[PDB]
Amino acid sequence: AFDECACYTTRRAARQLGQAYDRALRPSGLTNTQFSTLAVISLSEGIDLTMSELAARIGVERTTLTRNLEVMRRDGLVRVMAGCKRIELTAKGRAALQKAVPLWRGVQAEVTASVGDWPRVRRDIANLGQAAEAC
Amino acid sequence: AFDECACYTTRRAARQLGQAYDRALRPSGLTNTQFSTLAVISLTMSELAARIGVERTTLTRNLEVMRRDGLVRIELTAKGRAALQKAVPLWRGVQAEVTASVGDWPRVRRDIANLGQAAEAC
């Protein structure tokens, strides 16, 4: 019975989430990962960060992050100079993020309504991940 | 507050897990995805990719290496089935090790599946 594999189900879930979050964020012109990195930057501001230090925070691989960061800076959402690396939010980035928030907020509410207590489940999942990590 | 983001939390947890499973699967010579493709086939592409939970490009390149390793032909080969069977007890030992981090695994599993399921509906 492989249907219950923690890795499998969580992986399958996360992907479906990525799809729905992408769909919902369509109008803001952001992908879930892009939106994520932006949010992170808007939170931490620019700032000097390692690509691995950033990729880990968003929960992606360096290659994926970097490639995305490229398409993002290429689109004038972020400004990336040398520090490590200096990443900054552009006015346009702030705009897209601001526009994306309500969209992300709607899908978040619609998705986490499938569980009795989201905070509970979230913490569990995260605890499950950190558990895996420490393994 | 983007910490509570269901997409982030899951993606991160998923990654950490995939890594842990990779680590446990080593003796067999498989990755988690490779194991998950074998596992599925024993049971179209976008059809398959969607079920194991990976992108088409990912699935296809993985399918490439695996058929290159003689694991698949889609038919599992003798070697494919063997590679799968060897991984089983390993996956089991880690499946038990990880899920002990939660009170009722079946419940939290349901919640996670419901989560992705909720997304799918959208």
| CATH number of the CATH domain containing B82 | 1.10.10.10
Within a 13 Å sphere around the CA of A106, how many CA atoms are in the beta-carbon half? 13
CB contact under 8 A, B6 and A43: no
Q: Residue B61 in contact with residue B93, Cβ under 8 Å?
A: no
Q: Residue B116 in contact with residue A11, Cβ under 8 Å?
A: no
First to last CA, chain A: 22
Query: Rounded CA gap, A81 and A99, in Å?
Result: 25
CB contact under 8 A, B13 and A128: yes
Query: Rounded CA gap, A29 and A16, in Å?
Result: 19
CA dihedral B7, B12, B18, B20 (to 10 degrees): -150
Give how far A8 is from chain B: nearest CA, Å: 7
Q: Residue B109 in contact with residue A16, Cβ under 8 Å?
A: no
∠ CA A113-A114-A118, nearest 5°, is: 65
**Method by which this entry was solved:** X-ray
Closest Cβ opposite residue B122 in set A8, A110, A119: A110
Distances, alpha carbon B41 to alpha carbons A44, B44, B120, in Å? 44, 12, 23
Q: Residue B5 in contact with residue A14, Cβ under 8 Å?
A: no
In the three-class reduction of DSSP (H, G, I as helix; E, B as strand; rest coil), residue A82 is classed as strand
∠ CA B54-B11-A116, nearest 5°, is: 115
Query: Rounded CA gap, B44 and A131, in Å?
Result: 35
Nearest CA in chain B to A21: B7
Q: What are phi and psi of A2, to 5 degrees?
A: -100, 0
CB contact under 8 A, B36 and A128: no
Query: Rounded CA gap, B57 and B54, in Å?
Result: 8
In the three-class reduction of DSSP (H, G, I as helix; E, B as strand; rest coil), residue A25 is classed as helix
Alpha helices in B43-77 (DSSP H): 45-52, 56-68
Residue type, B100: A
Give how far B86 is from chain A: nearest CA, Å: 14
Query: Rounded CA gap, A125 and B10, in Å?
Result: 7
Which residues form the domain of B113? Answer: 1-122
- Total number of domains constituting chain B: 1
In the three-class reduction of DSSP (H, G, I as helix; E, B as strand; rest coil), residue B122 is classed as coil
CB contact under 8 A, B117 and A114: yes
Q: Which strands sit side by side in the sheet containing A85-89, from one edge to the other?
A: A47-49, A85-89, A78-82
User: Which residues are CB-contacts of B105 (< 8 A; sequence separation ≥ 6)?
Assistant: A4, A6, B99
Pairing of strands A47-49, A85-89: antiparallel
User: Which residues are CB-contacts of B107 (< 8 A; sequence separation ≥ 6)?
Assistant: none
